[PDB]
Amino acid sequence: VSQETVAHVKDLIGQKEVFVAAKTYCPYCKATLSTLFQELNVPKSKALVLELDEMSNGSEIQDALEEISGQKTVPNVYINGKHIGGNSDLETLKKNGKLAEILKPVFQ
């Protein structure tokens, strides 16, 4: 993956306060999105969700994402331009109480 693609994906990542790279027919992508938007009431106007398998450039976005973080799996979550991880990481932070404070400024 090119440095220009890498830079573009970083730009995508930091546009909105919540970023999720997901795919359709992905059980834990669904779980992640439900946690964020249905359980925790994150305003969708403050989020960018990419469905990579719907995007003609979906495959290179994912490669760029792996380059940036080393994560190969979806969902891939960033909050405030900072890498959260996948559904397992999100769930850890949810149970920790850390997620609520992480999201605090999204409700700002």
What does DSSP assign to residue 105? G
Other Cβ atoms less than 10 A from the Cβ of 62: the count is 23
Method: X-ray
Resolution (A): 2.1
Question: 78: annotated binding-site residue?
Answer: no
Q: Which residues contact 95 (CB under 8 A, 6 or more apart)?
A: none
* Domain total of the chain: 1
CA distance to 44, 63, 74, per residue, from 78 (Å): 14, 16, 12
Tell me: is residue 26 an annotated ligand-binding position.
yes
Q: How far is CA 24 from CA 29, 49, 81, 104, in A?
A: 8, 11, 23, 28
Torsion of CA 89, 18, 65, 71, to 10 degrees: 0
Task: Tell me the two tokens of residue 8.
Answer: 């573009």
Strand partners, 51: 22
Q: What is the rounded CA–CA span in Å between residue 37 and residue 39?
A: 6
- The parent domain of residue 81 ranges over 1-108
Tell me: is residue 88 an annotated ligand-binding position. yes
Token readout for 71 is: 């994560």
Instruction: Give the CATH number of the domain where residue 102 resides.
Output: 3.40.30.10
Q: What's the rounded Cα separation, in Å, for the pair 25 and 47? A: 20
Query: Where does 1-108 have alpha helices with state H?
Result: 3-13, 27-33, 58-69, 87-96, 98-103
The verdict on whether residue 87 carries a ligand-binding annotation is yes
| Residue 24, annotated as binding a ligand | yes
